[PDB]
């Protein structure tokens, strides 16, 4: 398994909320 | 398994809510 | 597992709210 | 007079070439 | 006169030339 | 005359060439 996430010029701005993450990687992801 | 996300100029704003992930990548994933 | 996970010219402003991660990785990940 | 160039989001590759300006503003311009 | 230019999240990349300028402004310009 | 030039998250790679100015600003400017 090989994961390249890569991000380049990004502009946020109000982001007033829960944000959990830009980028997300794992073996195993769950939510409930 | 390989993955590639890439990302090049973005612009988010007024995401009020609840943003979990902006690139995502796993083996496994489930939501309930 | 290989996880290569770069970010390059990022603008976050006016993030009020409960920020967790911008990159995230791990074996193993689960929100309830 | 009044001038408000905001760009966001951006992605420019392989411009080879003469590349004068991305965003411009005066009073006066001219070319020839 | 008044200018306002701003730029946010940006990926510029082989821009083999003769790049001048990204952001310009002046009174004046002109260009033989 | 008011001049406001902003940038934020810039990613620049691979410009071999004559980059001669990111960001400019002046009363009068000419090229020839």
Same mark, same amino acid.
């Given at each position: 398994?090989?994961?390249?996430?890569?991000?380049? %010029?990004?502009?946020?701005?109000?982001?007033? %909320?829960?944000?959990?993450?830009?980028?997300?990687?794992?073996?195993?992801?769950?939510?409930?």
């Amino acid at each position: 398994l090989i994961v390249t996430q890569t991000m380049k %010029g990004l502009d946020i701005q109000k982001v007033a %909320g829960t944000w959990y993450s830009l980028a997300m990687a794992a073996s195993d992801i769950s939510l409930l």
